[PDB]
Structures are given as structure tokens and as C-alpha cells.
Design an enzyme around this catalytic site. Structure first.
Site, PDB file in Angstrom:
ATOM      1  N   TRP A  45       0.297 -13.099   6.016  1.00 15.89           N
ATOM      2  CA  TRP A  45       0.181 -12.500   4.917  1.00 15.89           C
ATOM      3  C   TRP A  45      -0.414 -13.445   3.571  1.00 15.89           C
ATOM      4  O   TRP A  45      -0.392 -14.629   3.836  1.00 15.89           O
ATOM      5  CB  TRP A  45       1.570 -11.990   4.366  1.00 15.89           C
ATOM      6  CG  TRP A  45       2.479 -13.349   4.081  1.00 15.89           C
ATOM      7  CD1 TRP A  45       3.453 -13.807   5.380  1.00 15.89           C
ATOM      8  CD2 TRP A  45       2.795 -13.969   3.205  1.00 15.89           C
ATOM      9  NE1 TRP A  45       4.002 -15.003   4.848  1.00 15.89           N
ATOM     10  CE2 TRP A  45       3.683 -15.098   3.505  1.00 15.89           C
ATOM     11  CE3 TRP A  45       2.375 -14.066   1.918  1.00 15.89           C
ATOM     12  CZ2 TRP A  45       4.095 -15.972   2.708  1.00 15.89           C
ATOM     13  CZ3 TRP A  45       2.672 -15.108   0.803  1.00 15.89           C
ATOM     14  CH2 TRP A  45       3.868 -16.008   1.284  1.00 15.89           C
ATOM     15  N   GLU A  88       8.788 -25.246  -4.947  1.00 14.59           N
ATOM     16  CA  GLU A  88       7.585 -24.683  -4.176  1.00 14.59           C
ATOM     17  C   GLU A  88       6.156 -25.191  -4.695  1.00 14.59           C
ATOM     18  O   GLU A  88       5.280 -25.554  -3.971  1.00 14.59           O
ATOM     19  CB  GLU A  88       7.491 -23.234  -3.816  1.00 14.59           C
ATOM     20  CG  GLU A  88       8.809 -22.797  -2.971  1.00 14.59           C
ATOM     21  CD  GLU A  88       8.454 -22.764  -1.527  1.00 14.59           C
ATOM     22  OE1 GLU A  88       7.285 -23.549  -0.984  1.00 14.59           O
ATOM     23  OE2 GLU A  88       9.135 -22.320  -0.619  1.00 14.59           O
ATOM     24  N   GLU A 126       2.117 -23.194   3.335  1.00 17.51           N
ATOM     25  CA  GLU A 126       3.340 -23.278   2.239  1.00 17.51           C
ATOM     26  C   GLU A 126       2.741 -23.095   0.971  1.00 17.51           C
ATOM     27  O   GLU A 126       3.607 -22.517   0.054  1.00 17.51           O
ATOM     28  CB  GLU A 126       4.133 -24.490   2.463  1.00 17.51           C
ATOM     29  CG  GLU A 126       5.427 -24.382   3.408  1.00 17.51           C
ATOM     30  CD  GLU A 126       6.612 -24.232   2.179  1.00 17.51           C
ATOM     31  OE1 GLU A 126       6.653 -23.425   1.524  1.00 17.51           O
ATOM     32  OE2 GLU A 126       7.388 -25.084   2.497  1.00 17.51           O
ATOM     33  N   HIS A 129       3.537 -19.884  -0.909  1.00 16.96           N
ATOM     34  CA  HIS A 129       4.544 -19.691  -1.555  1.00 16.96           C
ATOM     35  C   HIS A 129       4.503 -20.015  -3.217  1.00 16.96           C
ATOM     36  O   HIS A 129       5.045 -18.909  -4.059  1.00 16.96           O
ATOM     37  CB  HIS A 129       5.769 -20.533  -1.246  1.00 16.96           C
ATOM     38  CG  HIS A 129       6.172 -20.322   0.442  1.00 16.96           C
ATOM     39  ND1 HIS A 129       7.020 -21.133   1.146  1.00 16.96           N
ATOM     40  CD2 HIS A 129       5.229 -19.636   1.324  1.00 16.96           C
ATOM     41  CE1 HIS A 129       6.834 -20.717   2.254  1.00 16.96           C
ATOM     42  NE2 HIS A 129       5.743 -19.920   2.734  1.00 16.96           N
ATOM     43  N   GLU A 179      14.190 -27.983   5.199  1.00 13.74           N
ATOM     44  CA  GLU A 179      13.573 -26.561   5.537  1.00 13.74           C
ATOM     45  C   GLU A 179      14.544 -25.550   5.613  1.00 13.74           C
ATOM     46  O   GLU A 179      14.438 -24.384   5.334  1.00 13.74           O
ATOM     47  CB  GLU A 179      12.228 -26.776   6.724  1.00 13.74           C
ATOM     48  CG  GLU A 179      11.278 -27.503   6.171  1.00 13.74           C
ATOM     49  CD  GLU A 179       9.914 -26.724   5.864  1.00 13.74           C
ATOM     50  OE1 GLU A 179      10.144 -25.864   5.010  1.00 13.74           O
ATOM     51  OE2 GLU A 179       9.034 -26.903   6.428  1.00 13.74           O
ATOM     52  N   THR A 182      16.085 -24.604   2.269  1.00 14.33           N
ATOM     53  CA  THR A 182      15.392 -23.589   1.418  1.00 14.33           C
ATOM     54  C   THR A 182      15.340 -22.187   2.207  1.00 14.33           C
ATOM     55  O   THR A 182      15.474 -21.265   1.390  1.00 14.33           O
ATOM     56  CB  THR A 182      13.659 -24.257   1.248  1.00 14.33           C
ATOM     57  OG1 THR A 182      13.197 -23.922   2.673  1.00 14.33           O
ATOM     58  CG2 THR A 182      13.668 -25.506   0.817  1.00 14.33           C
ATOM     59  N   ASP A 211       8.809 -17.900   6.528  1.00 12.20           N
ATOM     60  CA  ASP A 211       7.835 -18.916   6.819  1.00 12.20           C
ATOM     61  C   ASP A 211       8.849 -20.227   7.163  1.00 12.20           C
ATOM     62  O   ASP A 211       8.562 -20.953   8.140  1.00 12.20           O
ATOM     63  CB  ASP A 211       7.088 -19.101   5.978  1.00 12.20           C
ATOM     64  CG  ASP A 211       5.759 -18.386   5.698  1.00 12.20           C
ATOM     65  OD1 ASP A 211       5.700 -17.734   6.858  1.00 12.20           O
ATOM     66  OD2 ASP A 211       4.853 -18.491   4.982  1.00 12.20           O
ATOM     67  N   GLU A 212       9.647 -20.578   6.171  1.00 13.25           N
ATOM     68  CA  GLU A 212      10.636 -21.592   6.251  1.00 13.25           C
ATOM     69  C   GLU A 212      11.265 -21.741   7.663  1.00 13.25           C
ATOM     70  O   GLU A 212      11.345 -22.642   8.392  1.00 13.25           O
ATOM     71  CB  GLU A 212      11.295 -21.877   5.266  1.00 13.25           C
ATOM     72  CG  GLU A 212      11.012 -21.671   3.578  1.00 13.25           C
ATOM     73  CD  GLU A 212      10.102 -22.741   3.165  1.00 13.25           C
ATOM     74  OE1 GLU A 212       9.276 -23.271   4.061  1.00 13.25           O
ATOM     75  OE2 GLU A 212      10.053 -22.958   2.126  1.00 13.25           O
ATOM     76  N   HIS A 215       9.178 -23.077  10.443  1.00  8.41           N
ATOM     77  CA  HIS A 215       8.996 -24.268  10.170  1.00  8.41           C
ATOM     78  C   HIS A 215      10.078 -25.387  10.662  1.00  8.41           C
ATOM     79  O   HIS A 215       9.855 -26.323  11.411  1.00  8.41           O
ATOM     80  CB  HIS A 215       8.500 -24.661   8.879  1.00  8.41           C
ATOM     81  CG  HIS A 215       7.288 -24.071   8.033  1.00  8.41           C
ATOM     82  ND1 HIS A 215       6.838 -23.925   6.849  1.00  8.41           N
ATOM     83  CD2 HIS A 215       6.322 -23.424   8.868  1.00  8.41           C
ATOM     84  CE1 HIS A 215       5.899 -23.338   6.954  1.00  8.41           C
ATOM     85  NE2 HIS A 215       5.444 -23.182   7.956  1.00  8.41           N
TER      86      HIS A 215
END
Ligand SMILES: [Sr+2]
Ligand SMILES: [Sr+2]
Ligand SMILES: [Sr+2]
Ligand SMILES: [Sr+2]
EC number: 1.14.19.2
Lengths: 346, 346
Positions: A45, A88, A126, A129, A179, A182, A211-212, A215
Site C-alpha cells: 500500500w 515515525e 517505514e 508511515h 517494534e 509501536t 507493518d510493524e 517487522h
């Protein structure tokens, strides 16, 4: 207008320096084991996907529907959300902050190594974000873009010292924790946006949380491998991080108006349950549970001491930092420049 | 969907390794001589200064005037502008790209060294060019934010190899040139914005040009000092950069539709005179004129060869890359994804 530095001395290269080879070797491994938690760019995205579309006739109603919905979101929520955004947006810091790590360095900004390829690629995932959260905030007009942008200048200019000391061990343990931290925050900003009636914002937090999550899977998996290749020293570095406390990457935040910016922001996160002390314990607790530090055997005398420290720590943190909700009950009301010197309950 | 890497092998640490002391020593010097081309944050502009003000009754007309005005700017102009924005947006890369340079490294992401303090601080001042240029593009709705965002993911993920080989010599020469390059580009994007009748945008480029100007002053001043402390090796590294060609920080650009993105973007920069081959020569010419490499004496046999190479190069480039305007006369029309696959003259 003096910003904050950190109050601990410099510690660079605190790892047996031959150990650049443990990582040199793990190159192929990482390619097969970390470079898969990469979504190919063409399937990710981008921010545009969540904001009004400026090349559509819809643009106007979309911006207007955005702003209406944001009026129903309270000021305290916005402080927390802004906190996150700024964190971020301070991204260039964290690419440098992984690139200090010794064995897993980029060496030329385009190094064909697996670690580097991951670094560049993680950063790239990242960096959006920032774009998204910022464009969102800018449109809502609920917050003071100019101060927020200044805080960011103030943050990037001072970086952070998370006390990794160039250690790929320490580093990858840190990020692992940070990570997950967050993801929990973004998770609650999300739930809460939803509860205040703005699904499109929830969805923005939702996605970023997601996403985090990916990660943290990757990062836990590098530390897990090191609990096999070096059980002694990886607990030793994990006990080292816990004594040090995990200080979130935005602790130096400065808006030019507040010497306790970070403290104050965090007080609000806490009050709304976006990221409490409670949560902090669970991250460590999850990590002990996930790395099976619990079940490790045959450690040096110093290793065994490190294990039983880390293991029975979450119980402790849970209690002493329990009685810091009984400090959010009757706490003062205080202004934040990020919202035009309006006032939220700390 | 394979992106570009670069076609030159890895070259790390190509400088006599004791020379980390030449820079260790110059710490005080740099504090007095570079950390002044820092505008204290509280005196810097932020992006909010140049965009519609979302917490104002004005917001609506201001966005509306913005977009009306950008309809009067042509599609080619936007391609070039977008090129720039993407370059600027790939910022994390360049912080890493200074942080590979040996003598002048940040070592913990918060190193009290003068070089580091300048690095963080330079980074911070540059990261707002991104925010600003992006917000502006997003609002105009003249370009496809989602492709532009993807290109950025594609850029950050692949970094750049400008061939500095961790050399603070090479690095600071490079930036010196590249910083002037962006100032000339931004300058013309500005003039041209003005001529298409959009002062606000001109002002946006204008300001950004003005930051780069200050940075080139700083960067030329580090290389000038090195022509005093090491006349031999600094010409030797300068002749080294010129043989290598100065490849701008966005050469790996990929949108997922175009294997010659960078080539094609550049064709257009050239056609509009935003950054020509002609310009390229003048940057080198200015740099020979400014560093007084012209007037240096007592060089080794290898240094004397490097001087007369660098000195009589601008004349040469000027001619052979003259006949690349007589390639912009009858050049093809071709689509760019950044503008919805519309078609500008290359
Ligand atoms: Sr950004
Ligand atoms: Sr404002
Ligand atoms: Sr509008
Ligand atoms: Sr679109």
C-alpha cells in the site's frame, strides 16, 4: 532554546570485534529467513491509498468529510497521535541507528549484502508511515503543523542514543522490543479512532500496526537464531538492555516550549492506554516467552545470573509501575504547542 | 519488476586508514567554521510556512487557489519537479551516505562530535524539503501520488552508490558538487514556476534553493581546508571523482513501468534547462575557480597530472556534451507514470 541531549556517556563498539564473522556468515541465512517478510514494492500500500484523492472530483467532499470526522476526535487523542507521527517522521535517524551496528552494516549505501538490502528495504517500508500520518494530520487541521514540523527538526537534529553501542546483538534486541512497542501503540490509536467514530483513521493506524507486526516477526527471528549460535552472549546482551531500560526513539522531543515534552506526551499515552507501563512489561514477557530464554541451559555463571534477572523482571515492573495509574487519576491539565496551546489532562 | 542496481563493483575504505586523525583533530575547527551555516531551528522556516493553513477559515480558498494555479503549469514542468521531490524524499539514504565516510562518522546516532552534530543538523534542515514539496504536489492534484510514492519506496530500497568509498575526501567533494547541482535545478524550477505565473511555487523552490546554497558554502569550506592540509591527496581525490562522473543521487529511480526512468527524467530536465549538461560543466568550472586548484604548486608527479586533468576538463565537457541539445530538438514523446501515463516531450 536549549534542546535535550542524553545523560549517559558514549560507549561505542562494545562487542568482541571478531564477531563480525558470525554475521558475515549468516548472510545466506538472512536471505532465506528475513528477506521474505519483505512485501515486494508492487504489492505494498502507499499513503495515497488512505487519503482523499486529489485527482478525483471526489477530492473536495473527501477532505471535507475528513475534517468533519476529526472534530469528533478529542484533543488528548491528538496529542498521542501526534507523538507517534513525530516519532515515525524522525526516520532518517533509525536508518543511521541500524547502520551503526557493526556486523550488519551497509558500507556504501548500496551494499549487495543481505543485511543492507534488508535495511534499505525496511526503511523504505517505514518511510511511508510518516507521509501518511502527516498528510492525515495536515488535512484534519486539528493540530499545529508548524510546531509539529519544528519538533521534528528538533528531533532529527539530536538523534537518539538507545545504548546499542554498535552491537548487532544489542541493536536487534532493542528493535525487537521497540517494534512491538509501536505495534501496540498504533493498535490502540486504531481501536480508539474507531470508537470515536472515524474508521478511515482507524484503518490508517491499523495498517501501520500491521507493518510493524511484520517487522517484529523478522527482528525476533534474528535474535532467536543468535540464542542458538551464542546462548551465553545473547542473554548477556538481553540482560544488558533491561538494566538500561528501553528508551523509546523519541525521548529527545523538543518543541521549544516544553522541557518535559517526552515525559508529558508519555503521560497522555499512558492515561488513554495507548502505551502504558503495563504494556511495557508484556513486551518483555512476550519476548521471554517467545525466545524461550526460560528454557535455556548450560550458561556461564554470568549467563545464569542474566537469565533469572530477565525472567522474573516482568512481575516486578508490573507492580512498582502499577502505582503510576494512581498518578493519572488527579493529574494536572497542561498545554501542548502541538495543538495550539490548548490543554489536555496529563 | 526487477529494479536497477549499479554496474560498478564495491570499493570500501579507499583512503590511507591513519587519516581518521586529520579529521579527529579538525573537530574544533569545524565547530568554529561549519556549525554557523546552521540557522538555529527556532529561526528556520517550516513547510507550513508555504502551504494552505488547515486550521484557518482560509484553508478552502487557499487550496482552491493552489490547484487553479497548477493547471496553468505544464506537464513537463511537473515531471522535472517530481524528479526533484523524489530525490529530496529519499533523504534517509544521504544521512547514511555521509555516515559511511570514515573520519567524520556518527558512531552512536547522538555523537557529540562536531561532524556528527553537523550531520544530524544538516539532515534535519533537508528533511523539510521533502515534506514541503510533497504536500505541495499532493494538493495540486496534477500528479499521481501513488506512483510517486512507489518510486520513492523503490528508490530508498536500493540506495545509491556515488563512489565515495568511505572517503571523507571523496564524499565532501561529491556533496560539494551535488549540492550546487540541486541549487541550480531548484533555481530554475523556481524561475520557471514564476514565468508560468505561480509565485507561491516559485517561492517554494526559491527557499529550497536557498538552503542548498548555504550547504554548498559549508561543504566547499571543508574541501578548501583539505587543499591546505593535503594539497596532494585532495586533488588526487578530486581527479578521482571527475573520471568517475558525478552520478546524481536518484540514478536508480524506478516506477515499475520504466527501465530508463532516470535517463528519461533527465532528458526532460535538460529540455527545459532545469539542469543541463552545460550546467554540469559550470559546477566543475566554478569549483576549480573557487578552490584555486588552478594556482596550486609543489605537487607529486601524480598530483600535477590530476590538476591539469581537472583544470582543462570543463572546456571539453562543454563541447562533446553540447551536441546533446541537438538531441532534444526532434526527440520522441513518451509517457510518465508520475502523471497518469500522460505524455511529455523527452
Ligand atoms: Sr517524510
Ligand atoms: Sr499554523
Ligand atoms: Sr478543499
Ligand atoms: Sr491517484
Amino acid at each position: 532554546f536549549m534542546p535535550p541531549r542524553e545523560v549517559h556517556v558514549q560507549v561505542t563498539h562494545s562487542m568482541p570485534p571478531q564477531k563480525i564473522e558470525i554475521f558475515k556468515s549468516l548472510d545466506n541465512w538472512a536471505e532465506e529467513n528475513i528477506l521474505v517478510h519483505l512485501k515486494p514494492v508492487e504489492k505494498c500500500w502507499q499513503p495515497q491509498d488512505f487519503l482523499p484523492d486529489p485527482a478525483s472530483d471526489g477530492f473536495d467532499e473527501q477532505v471535507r468529510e475528513l475534517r468533519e470526522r476529526a472534530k469528533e476526535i478529542p484533543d488528548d487523542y491528538f496529542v498521542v497521535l501526534v507523538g507517534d507521527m513525530i516519532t515515525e517522521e524522525a526516520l532518517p535517524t533509525y536508518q543511521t541507528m541500524l547502520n551503526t551496528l557493526d556486523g550488519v552494516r551497509d558500507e556504501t549505501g548500496a551494499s549487495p549484502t543481505s543485511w543492507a538490502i534488508w535495511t534499505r528495504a525496511w526503511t523504505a517500508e517505514e518511510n511511508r508511515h510518516g507521509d501518511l500520518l502527516n498528510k492525515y494530520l495536515y488535512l484534519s487541521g486539528r493540530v499545529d503543523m508548524r510546531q509539529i514540523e519544528k519538533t521534528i527538526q528538533y528531533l532529527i537534529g539530536s538523534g537518539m542514543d538507545p545504548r546499542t553501542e554498535n552491537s548487532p546483538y544489542l541493536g536487534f534486541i532493542y528493535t525487537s522490543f521497540q517494534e512491538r512497542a509501536t505495534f501496540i501503540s498504533h493498535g490502540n490509536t486504531a481501536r480508539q479512532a474507531k470508537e470515536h467514530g472515524d474508521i478511515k483513521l482507524a484503518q490508517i493506524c491499523g495498517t501501520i500496526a500491521a507493518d510493524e507486526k511484520r517487522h517484529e516477526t523478522a527482528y525476533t527471528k534474528i535474535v532467536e537464531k543468535l540464542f542458538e549460535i551464542d546462548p551465553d552472549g545473547t542473554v548477556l546482551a538481553f540482560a544488558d538492555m533491561m538494566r538500561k531500560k528501553i528508551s523509546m526513539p523519541a525521548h529527545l522531543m523538543y518543541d521549544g516550549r516544553d522541557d518535559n515534552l517526552f515525559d508529558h506526551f508519555s503521560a497522555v499515552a499512558q492515561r488513554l492506554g495507548v502505551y502504558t507501563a503495563k504494556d511495557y512489561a508484556d513486551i518483555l514477557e512476550f519476548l521471554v516467552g517467545r525466545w524461550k530464554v526460560d528454557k535455556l541451559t548450560g550458561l556461564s555463571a554470568e549467563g545464569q545470573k542474566a537469565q533469572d534477572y530477565v525472567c522474573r523482571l516482568p512481575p516486578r515492573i508490573r507492580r512498582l509501575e502499577e502505582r503510576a495509574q494512581g498518578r493519572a487519576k488527579e493529574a494536572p491539565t497542561m498545554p501542548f504547542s502541538w495543538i495550539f496551546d490548548r490543554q489536555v489532562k496529563l
